[PDB]
Structures are given as structure tokens and as C-alpha cells.
Design a protein around this ligand. Sequence first.
Ligand SMILES: Nc1ncnc2c1ncn2[C@@H]1O[C@H](COP(=O)(O)OP(=O)(O)O)[C@@H](O)[C@H]1O
Ligand SMILES: [Ca+2]
Ligand SMILES: [Ca+2]
Ligand SMILES: [Mg+2]
Lengths: 154, 363
Amino acid sequence: YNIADSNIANLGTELEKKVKLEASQHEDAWKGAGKQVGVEIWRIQQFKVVPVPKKHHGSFYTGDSYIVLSTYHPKTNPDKLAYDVHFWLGAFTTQDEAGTAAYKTVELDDYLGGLPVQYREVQGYESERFLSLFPKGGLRILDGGVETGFHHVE
Amino acid sequence: TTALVCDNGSGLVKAGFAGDDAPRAVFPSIVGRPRHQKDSYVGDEAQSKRGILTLKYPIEHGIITNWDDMEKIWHHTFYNELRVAPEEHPTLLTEAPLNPKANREKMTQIMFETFNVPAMYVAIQAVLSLYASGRTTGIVLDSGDGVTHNVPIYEGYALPHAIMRLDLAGRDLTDYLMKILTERGYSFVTTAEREIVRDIKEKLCYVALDFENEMATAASSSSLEKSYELPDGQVITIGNERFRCPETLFQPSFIGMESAGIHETTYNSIMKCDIDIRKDLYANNVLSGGTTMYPGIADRMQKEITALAPSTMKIKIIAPPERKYSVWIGGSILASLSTFQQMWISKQEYDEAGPSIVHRKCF
Ligand SMILES: Nc1ncnc2c1ncn2[C@@H]1O[C@H](COP(=O)(O)OP(=O)(O)O)[C@@H](O)[C@H]1O
Ligand SMILES: [Ca+2]
Ligand SMILES: [Ca+2]
Ligand SMILES: [Mg+2]
């Protein structure tokens, strides 16, 4: 078609990135995120991004969806920070939770200037990078999970 | 404050409330008027009284071509179906990509000046479907009643140079089925009869895995034939029309279009993306929309893309069972997020900037 005359004429622009960067400033969960080397974890709970306590990192409810930010020093500079962001989808998570985890992963990527590399991690399909995040015996799958945020239309 | 999500399809309105797991109102995007030349009827009621009405779709190939009738559709959606006051509800609308810019400009104007919504946003349909599937990377094939579009998305951003669009979708397939059913001596002509054939198509059509083999099977015996009871009680029989009709998606020359088929367009879209992300796109083809509901279409897409792609390429077609509603569901999810709503156009912003603001806020 003629992209410039169309409703996708502003996709891929600095303006798109600027608008989405501003939106990411309105999520309390990202404040202070990615400031030092380590792993930060949030769980989606009825559309909200809720921190997971450090004592629970590596334990995931099979019914839920999570965002895992891994901050590390890149090979190029031992004093700077780079990011892998993994979203983990339990085998029994509901559609609202997985979709929010996906959207909010992009938003955390935006918040960090596009630097994070994204990884979709379905239970039982976790990447080598994801398996490497947790100490020996650290990755545990828990039964159950929090209730969906969806209202069910009968 | 609860946002409304309205996916205005070429064929069907899907409307409801953000946070619900399905649209609460789904009805034909049609206005009916007396066939003999109340004044008019909308939606389900026009369909019910179509015996005396001529039916018109205000949306053709994803574009609003009758704004007075589209205003009737929106009014009916708010006041008669959902029974809400639109001035109380931020509203999410949807659009196929590569629409002319003026379409969403007038959508924005009407929502604020006529319906007085407090806030609104216009989303690209395939992006909503990708999020409904729990992905940030993949390539969506969305096919409704008006448009088939391919949108590759990487880390949450659609790749505009690789977006593909074909103005060939469900309504063209219905029209083609009407045409070829005349070979059997059936005559489906009128706008009311088009709705009957649309139902035949939805109930009995399928995509053959090997078209030429299936044509031979259809001539060798009656094993593929199905019967269908018309509203007047007459029973008809259809045979190879069952799969010749959706074969048009793979062979657009069946209706005289020189276009690539949906398998080729999907492949062409992937090939317009950077080579290092192509494996991820091939493994994440997501089907969306009612015209992707034909039995056998995923298997046929798998076979055809395999023939086009490098011989070792891992290819996966994802066909969510709920994909008639995937766009709406993705909208319900995103419209439940305060950060997404932060990007919506407020009434004050519209008052000060006018319709042009939609291009600066909605991506
Ligand atoms: N089971 C089915 N098989 C084939 N086509 C279908 C099926 N169900 C719906 N359709 C077609 O899909 C279209 C409506 O689907 P939808 O995604 O709501 O379209 P739109 O968004 O354009 O209104 C119509 O062309 C309809 O006939
Ligand atoms: Ca859950
Ligand atoms: Ca990134
Ligand atoms: Mg649609």
C-alpha cells in the first residue's frame, strides 16, 4: 500500500517509542528495577504487577504468569548493566495473566530504553538461559496459583 | 470506571467491557431498510426481519464507507445492546493495518463529538491478537469478513515495512460460494440470500489438504457431500463447493485476483523481516479471525509454508480455539492496564488538538 497515507505511518518512529516510554513511567513496579546485578521477579495478580519476595525467587506457581528481570554486566564493560527479561507462563495460567505478562514485559523493556532482550518461557519449555538463573535445586514448580482477573461471561 | 472494548469488524460487532473474558454483545454489522422502496433496523433485528429488508454493511474491507449507517451501528451498540451511556466509558476501538488515515480520524471525531466518550484509543487488530496468545514475538494472520492481514511483531513492536494486507476475506468467500452454487442450479442473489450462503459456508466449508486430490475424490463418489436445510424448508446438497470456496484464500485467481495466496503472503512477510528473527516468526504463526476457522486451514498452512521455507525450518501454526474473539480478548486485557490507558486520547486533548491527535497517540 502507501504506508505514509495509512494508519501505520507512525509505526517504528521515535514518536512511538517516546509515547510508550512515557506510559512505562506510570508503573510502580519498575521504580528502582535493574539497578544492580541480580534477578528481580514479579507475578501478575488480577492484572497487577506484584513483586515476588526474594526468598521465593525460583519457585513459580503453575497457575500463574511471571516477569523475571536478569541484570548482568556485559562483556563490553564490567561496570555497566545489560538485561535479559523472561516472562514465565505456567502450564495452567489463564489468558489474562499470560497476556498481561507479555504486555508488561514489553513495557519493562521500554522503561529500560529497549535494552532488555526478551524471552518467552512456557513451563516445560524454559530456555537454557532461564534454567541457568537459579542455583542447583532452585527452580521449583508449585501447585495452584492466584485467581484470574477475568470476569467470566456466562 | 470500566472501559468499553469494541472490535468493529467488517461483518460483526464484538463489544463488551474490559476485564470480561468474552464480548457480551456480538451481532451483525448491518443496517437493513425496506426492500420495497421504522426507517431502518440494525444488527440482530435486521437479520431477523431480512425477509422484507435490503441489508447493507457500513464497513467494507475494513474501511467505513457509510458513516451515517456506522453511527447507527455505534449508537445501537451503546444504547440498545450494552445499554450504557458512552459518555461514562473510555472506549477502545480497533482497526486493520494499512487503512487510510482518515478512517481513524473520523472514528475519533465521532466518538468525541457525537458520543462524548471521556477517552478513547484505536488499536491495530493483529497486535491485540498476539497479546491474547501470550506472546511478544510472532506473526499474526488475521482474517475477518473484510481484510486478511499479516503483521510480524518483534519484542512487542510491529514491523511496518513487513506488514501485508489483502482485501480478500470472508465476504468475498461468501460471494464466491453464492456464485459457484449456481452451477448446481441454485440461485442465491439477494442480500438476504447472501446471509443464508454465509451460514452454509460457516457450517459446511473446509480447506482441502490437497486441492486436486480432493476434487478427484468429489467426482469419484458422494462421500464429501453434505445437505443443508434452507429457511423455507428446501434441502440442498453441496459437494466440492465445500472446499472450492476457501481454496480462494490460497488461489485468489478463483475470484480473478492476481494476488499471492495467504500462505505466500505469510512467507513474503517473514522474508521482509531481518533474517535473525525469521526462525522465531516461523515458529509463531498465530491465526486470528473468523475466516481462519475453516477445518483444515492450519494443516494446509503448515504444508504450504513448509514448501516455501528452507527445508530445515521449524514451522508452527497456532490456532487458538477462541480466535473468533482473539482481537477483542487482547483488547479486554490491555484496556484493563492503567499504563495502557495512560496513552488514550482524553476529551480535553481532542478538544484542543482535533482528530490529528489519534496519529500521535495510537500505535
Ligand atoms: N466456522 C467458520 N468457517 C468459515 N468462516 C467463518 C466461520 N465462522 C465465521 N466465519 C466467517 O468469518 C467472518 C466473521 O468473523 P469475524 O472475525 O467476526 O469478522 P469481522 O471481524 O470482519 O467482523 C465472516 O466472513 C464469517 O462468515
Ligand atoms: Ca493464576
Ligand atoms: Ca528490547
Ligand atoms: Mg475482525
